[PDB]
Amino acid sequence: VIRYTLWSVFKLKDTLPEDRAGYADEVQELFDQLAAKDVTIRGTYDLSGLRADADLMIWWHAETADQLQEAYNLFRRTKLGRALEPVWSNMALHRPAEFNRSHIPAFLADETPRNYISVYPFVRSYDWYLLPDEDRRRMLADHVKMARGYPDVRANTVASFSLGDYEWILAFEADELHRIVDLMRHLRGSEARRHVREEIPFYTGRRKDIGELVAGLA
Amino acid sequence: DLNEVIRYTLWSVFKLKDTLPEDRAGYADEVQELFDQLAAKDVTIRGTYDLSGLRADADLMIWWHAETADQLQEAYNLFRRTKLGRALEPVWSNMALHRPAEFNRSHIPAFLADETPRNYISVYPFVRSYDWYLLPDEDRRRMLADHVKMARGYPDVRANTVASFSLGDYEWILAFEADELHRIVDLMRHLRGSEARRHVREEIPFYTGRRKDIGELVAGLA
Amino acid sequence: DLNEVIRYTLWSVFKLKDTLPEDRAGYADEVQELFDQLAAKDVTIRGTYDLSGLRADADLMIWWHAETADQLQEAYNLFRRTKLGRALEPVWSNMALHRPAEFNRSHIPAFLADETPRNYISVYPFVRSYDWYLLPDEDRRRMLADHVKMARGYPDVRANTVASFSLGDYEWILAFEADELHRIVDLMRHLRGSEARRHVREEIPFYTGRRKDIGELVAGLA
Amino acid sequence: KDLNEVIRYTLWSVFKLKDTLPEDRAGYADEVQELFDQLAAKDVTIRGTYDLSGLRADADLMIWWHAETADQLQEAYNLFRRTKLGRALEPVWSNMALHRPAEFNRSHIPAFLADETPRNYISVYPFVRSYDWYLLPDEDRRRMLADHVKMARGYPDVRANTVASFSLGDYEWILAFEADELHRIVDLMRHLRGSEARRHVREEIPFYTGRRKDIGELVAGLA
Amino acid sequence: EVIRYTLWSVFKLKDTLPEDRAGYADEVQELFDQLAAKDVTIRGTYDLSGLRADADLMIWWHAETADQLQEAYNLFRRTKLGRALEPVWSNMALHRPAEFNRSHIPAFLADETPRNYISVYPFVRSYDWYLLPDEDRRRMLADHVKMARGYPDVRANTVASFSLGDYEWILAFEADELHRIVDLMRHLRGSEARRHVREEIPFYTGRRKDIGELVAGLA
Ligand code: NA
């Protein structure tokens, strides 16, 4: 029913120490104690190279915003956290859909998280929500029909009104990176594209467990 | 009346330079002593709010109000001299002032009414379209009326709407309070169906967080 | 009297690097000493203003004017060498030049009419729409005249409208002065009803604060 | 036919000096050349290293590299950041793109994929089209893009690399133009302002324009 | 048919210069002399301080190739003065023949003398400006030149910069009286070409100074 989800992006302050021995195990220990507290770490992602101002993303969710705030601060006390600068951190809340109330975010359907993710915020035009419900229904229905040829890339569209600067946070997961690219380009032919004001920054990266992630960062 | 009282309100947003020390003993105590010293029947502290996690560039917000802007400036600088203030970077600090409404003159912001602050807050500046204030009065009145109607189902969400022309970059500062955070998001989504949404130029940044006494706030920050 | 006389105006905004030392002994004295020397060269400091709290990224403004831009540049650099100057970071510094008005050539900025500085200021730059200067002269005259008409309910708010084309990013710098801050807010709100509001492109950042002696200003900063 | 059917990711990574390189920088270029040699032994291609200094204030060096997976380029990026030169630099702008078949002319293959040799000057910039461009009748897009390559015909010495980047970053395409005469890029871009497709543009900044150099000469000439 | 690249490089102080700065201007002047022996011309150094919070110094230099100006820029950044500065904005342009009035070239290529004051800014036209019928553009540019004929003492430098940076043109106006640049710019707001502008910021305006005087005047 009520599930908050948070995507927290970090950049390296400079590089990690040449010997970073306890770094990944301290974080893994924290992740283990948070799961005990009903905070789910859906994934950590390597963003480096694909963005100059970002290296790491944590995707976590829980029943209250407050538990995600605590996890965020606990992570920052970590040795890895203390080597990182926060860049972008945005929360969303799963609410019922306007028209098709079967659409549940992948993370909420206990679906396996895929190898690649592309996360971006979203803001519609000023008049989108003022259109006749009939018009908003048709365009969203088209939106899912054209997506139907990409069932291998899983959608996570969550409301974020009033939690930050946006209206929705979107997160697409797929095991092949080029499938997110092709879907995104295909969805440019949707007529809902006439009703967009903002959809950046894009944070795109590779799911890794924390040991390998720490090892591959500069 | 209470529309002829002058009361300035300030929202001051800060970010940790890094993290607080492992040993932060007197940190929250020093700030509390400042607060009731400030409260010496003059500068009111409506709340301190934990914003961390909900945005990367902010960690705490102070909401204070007083009879003059000068008192709020002094309070601001005094806070920056505390140990906690010296661990923080200012991020966004905007002042506003209750001015009598154009139409419904008994909408008073909750803070000037002395109502109890709620668990969660969402504050953002607001700038209307260039011709909103040029519209026929009844057009504006109807849209604002349609807008009040669209909120009828959220009496639990308290709205502060306060004029800020020429005090900073904006026209209004808005602050919504509620005990359940999900009610603020639902109200916001619902209000997207209001006809006044066609007369908006700016409405960010959003600063949203959990009201906490300074003790637990200092303890939970990185 | 003199529209043909040349007077450059500069508003220089600074931000604390961190916090002033607790012993800030000769900080204000060095700056006052500098200001008295500048006055000897007919570089006049109209005011120093406390911006802190009303803005997170600014703490102090200096308003100075002189017969040449060169003299104001020299004063700025001299200020930056004082102890107080080395504790600040420049934020926004913008020059303007009095140029005779288009129609109401009897419009003189308050700083050129020997009006004494008021206790509060609100300073912002201004950029008109692209076609404003392309409208028939009479449509521009009417809008400028009506805007003058709406502003006569606020004779206690003194205007300083000065051209800045090609000295920086803007077309005008504006500075309003009043002994009561809430009257600047109300004027700005009232002028939103002016038809010229359909011909605006940019009017931020706003820098608003309290005029203060440099000694009291140095004392009250963090 | 298996030209656009392969998968080749390409990355342009831009860095700024933190301040200045040391006067004694004896091993700096050598370490990087070593890494580039090692990476070539991994099928990561360094198409070029470019000196961007002076042409903008916020950038000094660009690396253009491509490989079969995004992952390989991520690894290379981080390896470069560990070198002595990499540690004297600040990341500025790093964007990835992936060759996909063009909508109308599948005979448009980016120069680096047609394995043309790198020219002396490069101009790199991202691109975002208007909201309605992808909604237009397929005829209009066909016509305006045909209009576009026809006007580009007077500049065959300027080689084009237009690569899709949807959901890899903030943009829709990354473009890179290469020529041995910098002024020919300027004249091409000016001439292309007369194209009907210019009515369907939302973003095309930052431009990173610079001179291709061997890493030894690059390092010796940086401040 | 000549190729001349022109670069405007803007810097700001990291903090202030040392109270004792005896070798700073000398060293830079030596570099300028060494560059003159490679036909890299320094048209001027300009004091921007005070008119801009985030800029203190501009160098205007031009050479036959972009590469020479890169070398010069990096050489400057190695001087003691260069080490006390942060790069802010550095943009190159290239003189290309005009679409209509081929009789107009920038002042610096006509080798006339640099004036006391400069105002430099980039320029980007509307998307449809280059799409208008040639006669509409020709009329608007012609009338705009007519509006500027009352200011012969303000010298214009309009130089193409497509694909060298974020802009389409770099403009630089030189005059011995600063108020005449203000008045011309105000006057030209009544030109119909103002309907075809997308960007014209930042403005960097300052006072031409010899490097010795400029180093001594900076905070
Ligand atoms: Na990127």
The DSSP string of A8-28 is: EEEEESS---S--TTHHHHHH
**What separation in angstroms does the CA of A17 have from each of B201, C76, C102?**
46, 44, 65
Q: Which CATH class name applies to D9-99+210-221?
A: alpha beta
| CB atoms B167 and C208 under 8 Å | yes
The amino acid sitting at C130 is Y
Stated resolution in angstroms: 2.0
**Which active-site residues of E does the annotation give?**
121
Question: Tokens 């950041």 correspond to what residue?
Answer: D81
Residues of E with CB under 8 A from a CB of D: 3, 7, 9-10, 65-67, 69-74, 77-78, 82-83, 87-92, 94, 96, 127-128, 130-131, 160-166, 168
Residue entry with tokens 């790199």: D124
Tell me the angle at which helices C69-81 and C27-40 cross, rounded to the nearest 10 degrees: 160
**Whether D144 contacts D197, CB under 8 Å:** yes
Our measurement of the distance from residue E68's CA atom to the centroid of its chain's CA atoms, rounded to an integer in Å, reads: 17
Residue type, B51: L
Burial degree of B36 (CB within 10 A; 0-12, 13-18, 19+): exposed
Known binding residues of A: 143
The residues with which A119 forms a beta bridge, in sequence order, are A171, A203
User: Measured at the alpha carbon of residue D204, what is the angle toward residues D183 and E99, in degrees to the nearest 5?
Assistant: 45
Distances (CA, A) of A21 to A18, A24, A25, B67, C128: 9, 7, 8, 56, 59
Question: What technique was this entry resolved by?
Answer: X-ray
Give one DSSP letter per residue of D86-146, joined into a string. Answer: HHTEEEEEEEEEE----SS-TT---TTTTTPPP-SEEEEEEEEE-TTGGGS-HHHHHHHHH
Q: Nearest chain A Cα to D100, which residue?
A: A182
Q: Please answer whether residues E107 and E62 qualify as being in contact, where contact means their C-beta atoms are separated by less than 8 angstroms.
A: no
CB-CB neighbors (< 8 A) of B57 in chain A:
86
Distance CA D104, CA D108 (A): 9
D94/A50 Cβ within 8 A: yes
How far apart are alpha carbons B79 and B31 in whole angstroms?
Answer: 7
A51 CA to middle of ligand 1, Å? 3
Q: How many other C-beta atoms are found inside a 10 Å radius of the C-beta of residue A116?
A: 23
Residues from chain A contacting residue B185 (CB–CB below 8 Å) = 93, 95, 159-163
In angstroms, the CA C165 to CA C124 distance is 14
Q: Tell me, in angstroms, the distance from the centre of ligand 1 to residue D123's CA.
A: 17
Which stretches of chain D are DSSP H helices? 28-40, 70-82, 84-87, 138-151, 182-191, 215-221
The answer to whether the beta carbons of residues D165 and A177 sit under 8 Å apart is: no
The token duo for D33 is: 């050349």
Cα A10 to chain centroid, rounded: 13
Mutate to test the interface with E, among D93, D195, D207, D222 (most CBs of E within 10 A): D207
**Top CATH class, C8-97:** alpha beta
| Cα gap D177→D127, rounded to integer Å | 13
Pair A92, A159: CB distance under 8 Å: yes
**Do chains C and A touch, with touching meaning 3 or more CB–CB pairs less than 8 Å apart?**
no
| Residues of chain B positioned with their CB less than 8 A from the CB of A87 | 56
Residues of D near A (CB-CB distance < 8 A)?
A: 7, 11, 13-14, 70-71, 73-79, 81-82, 86-87, 91-96, 98, 100, 131-132, 134-135, 164-170, 172
- Give ranges for CATH 3.30.70.1030 in chain C: 8-97, 110-208
- A4-93 homologous superfamily: Apc35880; domain 1 (3.30.70.1030)
CB D212 within 8 A of CB D48: yes
Interface touch C167/E203, C-beta < 8 Å: yes
Strand partners, D211: D51, D121
CA E85/CA E79 separation, integer angstroms:
10
Architecture in CATH of C110-208 = 2-Layer Sandwich (3.30)
Look at E217 and C77 and tell me if their CB atoms are within 8 Å. Answer: yes
CA C49 to chain centre: 10
CA distance A157 to chain B (A): 15
Q: Does domain D121-209 have CATH number 3.40.50.2300?
A: no
Touching partners of B (3+ C-beta pairs < 8 Å): A, C
CATH numeric code, B120-208: 3.30.70.1030
Provide residues of A within 8 Å CB-CB of chain D.
14-15, 46, 48-53, 118, 120, 172, 177-178, 180-185, 188-189, 191, 193-194, 196, 200-202, 204, 206, 216-218
Ligand 1 center–CA D17 separation, angstroms: 19
Q: Find the catalytic residue in B124, B154, B170, B207.
A: B124
Is C13:C207 a contact under the CB 8 Å cutoff? yes
* Alpha helices (runs of H) in C6-95, residue ranges in sequence order: 27-40, 69-81, 83-86
- B8-98+210-220 belongs to CATH 3.30.70.1030: yes
Q: How far apart are CA D178 and CA A116, in angstroms?
A: 32
In the chain, the amino acid numbered D50 is Y
- CATH 3.30.70.1030 residue ranges of chain A are 4-93, 106-204
B124 catalytically annotated: yes
- Residue in B74, B80, B168 closest to C208 by CB: B168
Residue in D closest to A173 by C-alpha: D167
Question: Which residues of chain D does CATH 3.30.70.1030 include?
Answer: 9-99+210-221, 121-209
Q: Which segments of E21-170 does DSSP mark as H helices, in order?
A: 24-36, 66-78, 80-83, 134-147
Tell me the shortest Cα–Cα distance from C84 to chain E, in angstroms.
Answer: 13
In 3D, which of C36, C148, D186, A44 has the Cα closest to residue E93?
D186
Ligand 1 midpoint to CA D6 (Å): 23
For A106-204, CATH number? 3.30.70.1030
Length of chain B measured in residues: 222
Per DSSP, the three-state class of D54 is coil
Tell me the C-alpha distance between A124 and E122, whole Å: 32
* Among B120, B109, B110, B105, residue whose Cα is nearest residue B172: B109
Catalytic one of D125, D155, D171, D208: D125
The annotated binding site of E is made up of 144
Q: Could you tell me the fold of the domain covering E5-94+207-217? A: Alpha-Beta Plaits (3.30.70)
Strands B44-50 and B88-97: unpaired
Report chain B residues whose CB lies below 8 A from the CB of C200.
Answer: 130
How many angstroms separate the CA atoms of A206 and A119, rounded? Answer: 12
Q: Please give the DSSP secondary-structure letter assigned to residue E172.
A: E
Note residues around ion ligand 1 (Cβ under 5 angstroms): A 51; D 95, 169
How far apart are the C-alpha atoms of C73 and E48, rounded to whole Å? 8
For residues B25 and B29, what is the distance between their CA atoms, to the nearest angstrom? 8
Q: How far is the CA of B125 from the centre of ligand 1 (A)?
A: 29
User: With touching defined as 3+ CB pairs under 8 A, do chains D and A touch?
Assistant: yes
Q: How far is the CA of D93 from the centre of ligand 1 (A)?
A: 6
- Do E60 and E10 touch, CB atoms closer than 8 A? no
Catalytic residues of A: 120
Distance in angstroms (rounded) separating the CA atoms of residues B70 and C113: 28
Cα(A50) to centroid(ligand 1), Å: 5
Backbone angles phi, psi at D19, to 5 degrees: -145, -80
Contacts of E124 in chain D (CB under 8 A): none
Q: Taking the CA atoms of chain E, what radius of gyration do you get in angstroms?
A: 18
Residues of D in contact with A48 (CB under 8 A): 74, 77-78
Q: In Å, how far is C217's CA from the nearest CA of chain E?
A: 21
For residue C148, report the phi and psi dihedrals to the nearest 5 degrees.
Answer: -60, -40
Q: Which of C166, C167, C201, C204 to mutate to test the interface with E (most CBs of E within 10 A)?
A: C166
Task: Report the distance separating Cα D151 and Cα C168, nearest Å.
Answer: 38
Whether cis (ω within 30° of 0) applies to the bond prior to C136 is no
Radius of gyration of chain A (CA): 18
Cα angle D25, D27, D29; round to 5: 85
The helix or strand, by DSSP H or E, that contains position A65, with its residue range, turns out to be: helix A65-77
Provide the CATH topology of domain E117-205: Alpha-Beta Plaits (3.30.70)
**CA of residue B24 to ligand 1 center, whole Å:** 38
d(CA D174, CA D185): 16
DSSP assignment of B11-70: EEEEEESS---S--HHHHHHHHHHHHHHTTTT-EEEEEEE-BTTBTT--EEEEEEESSHH
Which of helix, strand or coil describes residue E24? helix
